[PDB]
Design a protein around this ligand. Structure first.
Ligand code: NAD
Ligand code: NAD
Ligand code: NAD
Ligand code: NAD
Ligand code: ADN
Ligand code: ADN
Ligand code: ADN
Ligand code: ADN
Lengths: 412, 418, 412, 424
């Protein structure tokens, strides 16, 4: 009752998972604190989130708290096969491998919304990006009354929730967990992706980072840390001013398309790098995306219009254009940190995932309350604000950070 | 109808103000856009904010939109005398000079609460730190019902608004301009902290160990500034979120006791009392530098220090050297008053343009909604943020200066971003 | 007449090499400029230097100029098997694979000092770290008078040359090529190696960087950029003062050994991380070396005293001590950038490799006029200072750097 | 026997000097170690070096070691009047004030070249820029045979010596102290560049575009300073090596004319003339700030700016605003003279301690070897560096102040580096 690339990678995955646990004290602490009470006993969680070593620790936290889970990846190139095998070996139903086709992707999510114990139906959703949420609401309406809550990981997913809400298409309440982890995360995993794919030198290069939210900020800091000159693009005046204040030129993509060695899309929006840009790119320009959906880059156009295509090695594709110059595309435009490397490290993921677990507890344990209503009163909510202090404190010992104590006088 | 140190500094103040104007396109654009409609005609603003070159651009912006003003500074050591004189010369009543006594300070704020046209009473408050807000509510109860609104500049001022509200002591509605700090507080301090320390002491930053107390936007800027020059910064915090942030930024997070013997420089940024104490001074290395950049000097136990030192020498104004029983020295900046304004010129005018543009839009907002119950007087009185569309407006006004070019969304892109 | 791991990796290695050529304008310009004149015709170069994609470009540059070459790697873990294969395929004798044993390592170097055309002997040495130099001098006395020069890449190798000279044991003249590129290289490749090995988060960590020469400076800057707190150790007061001026605490290994998450040795010296340190290290502390020799870390002691060992994957080993805690060792203490990632990237390797080619021309072409004496008068020399300018100039267009012209009046 | 602005600034001067002392352990330790033996007893030193608080500590170190000194500043706008006053009040002949005229500047130097005990003549030169060196050689040839050595502080002065030498015009031997430069220049400018700009103008660095011309140690420090505060720096260079370094550090390398219309701030650091010219001023954006941190003001064509501006306003001393014919303004700092010293206090004490400690060791070295020909007078004269091992000695003196703990090599480790228990 699983489908993965190679069950024999399980032993390697288990060792890697053991290393991540030691980097994920938030998750390990929730097991110690909540294990005895089993606050997720009864929960049947359909999960759609990149099947990584980090996610494996999230799954075993939810399981240790009593949940039953069925799992798939939310991207065709993000699964870490050793992690998926490590989880599959333990008997958790998981349907994930690195390098899925579109139809295999859709097949995998569908395996997670049936096959549980009892009537075989999920009662909880854990998503990021919003593919499992959209699949259930739009293609399993009979499931909709069965689901007590959604927890959502990422900006793109959160925007999908409000999109649905505004026009009466959200029948299940959600907890927004996405709302600087993604700044610090991309600060280390963007260049990891790029280097594993190309080994290219960052120092001395001109780079074009499109967008300057938390993800752009982190990407821009990462490249600049290594001696790249970063040019930023933005549609928002607030973020553009912040980029200038941080020492970056803010320009149009067209202003730099002929000089940039590297292009990185962070917008969460479509058609950022287009047919109007590719013909003008310098020889062997590197093109990649770190936004949730690959459509930030017109990959379709690029493949259809190149005179020649060579695969350097998986997720590194080199295209020869009519003009004779080359373009290097990473992970076919899919999120480059997970596509070409390992995504965000454990320590930062511990923050986000500790909230994921808390969001699942909060929705499950209030399923009959009208606190998170189903149907027409359904909304999008935040975790109670005291939990942000809870999560943060759980990570201080690991870094040796020692907190000062207010005196009675100071508190008041 | 004013009191400043020296009216002859007016011409120099005027030239500095003209340079500031060129660095404050937000304020200069408000004059262009709103001059015609005189939206503040009838407003009588009592202002209590550091009387600097930057504040003069603010005053003359409010004046150009039709307001009547009386002004004081919100700190005894923050006034720039040339800017105060330039304003006095124009006929705006201003009561401010660098180096006021506590009594002169209180006198100055009292001058802003009378002497207008008509009944002579203010109808609006623009405040920084809350001294004038407290003065009106606590000492002028007859005046309270004539004040249509407060705009507050700073974090501690905002903290004071909520504390008041929670005790049933806030009868006037306020707009929170500090949180409308992402900019003012971080970018501002990142440049003005070391400027203050340098003008005061000429000390090298590289090689030093610095203790930065607190890690909000103010502490983040300060720490970034000392770090950039090659200092090793140790951060202290009571809040786990902020402490994790500091550690993610490469800083050791520790107690003041952990570094008190090693730190060349101590900077308090908490907005709280008793950060650097009697428990700390006796253990500091020779010529350790102590300063504060939070709103009130009581972050440092200045009183205890002055009382317990064996000798005191004034190196130059706002730079004081204390010899302890140790035989060792401590250098104190601006008697613990905000060091950037006390020893240098505070935040540069570019970033002040952001906070002051907001300040003006807030006075406009509160003033024009006079008869609305949108900003209730009496029992329903609250703290409000500026309407959110204005944050984009303000940012946009500062982009041309920096040569920042915005991308235009296509119709399809615009549809699917809203 | 070669020995590599897998010849079928050649096609992949060739694509990698083609991408590197584009990032190495120095070497490609030498081919264009010196191709016609064949300045190395007759030279028979025994080469001992990390068999990487970058080195493959160097090998082909030397061959394009007329050299005959036989190659080995100067480290058991640094070879990139795709690069070794692509070179082997062309018919250049190379004896290198990732994961050599010591006997295999020695055998590989033996293969490069015999088997050329004519009498089968080399007449030129290209070295990285001194091993090939030491082999010829100490174990091949008959060969010594046949070698017309040595060029040496690295600090450790340069110190070995001056040591030999001072004892009268240098019978062959050398060009010191080592003498910032190591700073820029390590700043990008130290973290690349740590991350490919462990996927650990850098932000929030305490790191102990031993040594503050160009390598240490780059390592510290890398770790600091990702938000680590770096403590530096030094024996030289000049380097120690620089580290303080750059914002780093300078302390002893024993001052931080209990708290450091990562240890990085950069000294070029032995016994930096010892039996006096391992037992006090926190759980899952990461220990790695980026200096030329592994003996900076007491790996033999660690392995002999660990109560448990687990290979997480090749070149990542976790040791359980008697105290119950774990130590993570990267590449068995061998240079971590090369052993766990790909080493310095192409662009920066182009600087020193352009100089290697030039040193080799210089030595070879002046082999008879006594400019570089053999025997008693042998010395260590530098390239003429005007070549430093020429090499740098070849790399400016790639980064879009526009040089200002002095006016005639400014020149004087 | 002195000429300063205002002897009543002596009290302030002295307090500041005492604080500087605490920041200058190199000089303070040399006082302690060489005091008893009086190595400079007999030395008569003509000094020409910015008359700052830092220099005062240097002066008093030299006197504490037995020297007679006569001092002038090496720049018109760099004297700190409180420091000069404190020095004069001790009875050391000093001729220096902030804001000297050219004529007064030369007069000041002339006063240092006579008036000692005995025949009233100097036998040593401590220089910064080469002005005093050039006066003695070109204008006092009867004095050349009397001078036992020159110690030179700065890059420009060192260029001046090599230039002289190559034309047979160096008859006194010099110690190159500048090559110090790894420290003084980079770390010093990194803090003092922006200090000068801000004291002058209070301008925000964040968000600005800056043109930094040259990328030697000074340009590197100036670029790092501006970038730290969030400015975007464009670097200009004539040397491919430096240009590649700037590029590997994340800076665009371009021509002045590529960024002259966009730049808010211009900083010249080349040590060369005619960097910012009549070709640039007319295209500058409104209130562009132009300054120089290189030794001579002629990097910027100030003569031209002043003669061609339609309006001039002195904002305050050393801050001058010019209205061009196009109606736009240009803000010039310290009339193009070194901005860190001209508009602020120069490099801070701690870093000057390294440079000045070398200065003292250079004077001891030249003086104590005067009758043995190690440093030849006459046609055999040349430029030398300090003994190699003094570098480590100087650096080690400054480690305690910053709390840096040195690792001690074991005997086995010293064998391997092949060094004593000098290192590099
Ligand atoms: N790969 C990862 O590990 C990772 C991590 C977090 C988030 N994400 C995804 O990355 C994306 C960005 O996340 P975020 O939190 O920064 O979102 P964000 O919305 O805060 O940032 C996007 C920014 O892009 C700007 N933008 C939109 N269209 C643009 C265009 N036409 N040109 C230039 N700028 C444009 C917007 O103004 C906005 O400031 C989202 O899709 C999110 O789901 C990925
Ligand atoms: N000088 C200026 O130009 C300037 C500019 C902006 C704000 N301010 C003032 O600076 C102060 C701080 O502003 P902010 O926006 O950063 O406020 P903030 O509330 O966001 O930051 C203060 C931080 O200090 C911490 N803290 C509180 N007590 C502490 C203690 N005893 N020890 C260690 N940490 C402690 C809190 O956790 C908090 O993170 C306020 O007084 C504000 O008005 C001054
Ligand atoms: N892995 C790579 O890609 C790479 C690149 C260049 C150089 N290297 C090698 O790295 C090593 C360092 O190179 P470098 O150029 O920085 O040389 P370096 O000699 O300039 O730096 C070594 C530093 O370590 C210090 N040191 C020596 N022993 C010490 C000890 N016991 N404790 C603390 N500090 C000590 C020295 O004082 C010196 O400052 C050499 O072995 C060199 O060949 C490796
Ligand atoms: N103000 C101070 O405290 C201070 C401190 C140290 C040195 N200095 C002075 O600063 C100047 C520079 O010192 P440095 O040590 O950096 O010298 P340097 O010679 O090492 O650097 C100057 C750089 O400028 C470049 N350059 C020359 N002409 C150029 C031009 N036309 N356009 C662009 N680049 C050009 C050169 O290639 C060189 O790299 C000297 O005059 C020195 O004496 C001042
Ligand atoms: N290593 C990882 N494992 C699982 N999810 C990750 C990892 N790195 C990033 N992500 C998540 O992917 C989401 C975008 O799809 C981001 O919000 C981010 O949290
Ligand atoms: N130059 C300045 N002029 C006026 N107000 C300033 C200046 N610099 C800082 N401030 C304000 O002082 C407040 C703290 O009292 C901060 O909110 C900050 O905005
Ligand atoms: N990718 C690489 N290919 C070949 N040599 C490298 C590479 N990266 C680093 N090196 C060299 O290894 C030497 C240390 O033995 C360093 O001086 C460095 O130049
Ligand atoms: N505070 C200072 N006192 C004296 N000289 C200084 C000071 N700051 C910089 N300088 C020197 O000015 C010389 C250039 O004229 C530089 O070599 C620099 O060392």
């Amino acid at each position: 009752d699983y489908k993965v690339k190679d069950i024999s990678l399980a032993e390697w995955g288990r060792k890697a998972i053991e290393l991540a646990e030691n980097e994920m004290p938030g998750l390990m602490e929730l097991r110690r604190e909540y294990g005895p009470s089993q606050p997720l006993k009864g929960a049947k969680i359909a999960g759609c989130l990149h099947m990584t070593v980090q996610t494996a620790v999230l799954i075993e936290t939810l399981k240790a708290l009593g949940a039953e889970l069925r799992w798939s990846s939310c991207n065709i190139f993000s699964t870490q096969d050793n992690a998926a095998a490590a989880i599959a070996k333990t008997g958790v139903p998981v349907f994930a491998w690195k390098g899925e086709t579109d139809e295999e992707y859709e097949w995998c999510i569908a395996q997670t919304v049936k096959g549980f114990s009892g009537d075989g139906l999920p009662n909880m959703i854990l998503d990021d990006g919003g593919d499992l949420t959209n699949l259930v609401i739009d293609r399993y309406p009979e499931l909709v009354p069965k689901i007590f809550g959604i927890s959502e990981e990422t900006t793109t997913g959160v925007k999908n929730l409000y999109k649905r809400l505004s026009k009466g298409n959200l029948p299940i309440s959600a907890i927004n967990v996405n709302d600087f982890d993604n700044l610090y995360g991309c600060r280390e995993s963007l260049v990891d992706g790029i280097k594993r794919a190309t080994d290219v030198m960052i120092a001395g290069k001109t780079c074009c980072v499109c967008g300057y939210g938390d993800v752009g900020k982190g990407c821009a800091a990462a490249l600049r840390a290594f001696g790249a000159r970063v040019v930023v693009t933005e549609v928002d005046p607030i973020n553009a001013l912040q980029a200038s204040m941080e020492g970056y030129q803010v320009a149009l993509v067209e202003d730099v398309m002929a000089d940039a060695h590297i292009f990185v899309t962070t917008t969460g929006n479509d058609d950022i790098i287009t047919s109007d840009h590719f013909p003008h790119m310098r020889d062997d320009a590197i093109v990649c995306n770190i936004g949730h959906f690959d459509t930030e880059i017109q990959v379709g156009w690029l493949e259809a219009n190149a005179k020649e295509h060579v695969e350097i090695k998986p997720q590194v594709d080199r295209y020869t254009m009519e003009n004779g110059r080359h373009i290097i595309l990473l992970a076919k435009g899919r999120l480059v940190n997970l596509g070409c490397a390992s995504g965000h490290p454990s320590f930062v993921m511990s923050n986000s995932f500790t909230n994921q677990v808390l969001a699942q507890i909060e929705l499950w344990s209030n399923r009959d309350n009208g606190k998170y209503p189903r149907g027409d009163k359904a909304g999008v909510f935040f975790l109670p604000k005291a939990l942000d202090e809870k999560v943060a404190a759980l990570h201080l010992a690991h870094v040796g950070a020692k907190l000062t104590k207010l005196t009675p006088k100071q508190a008041e």
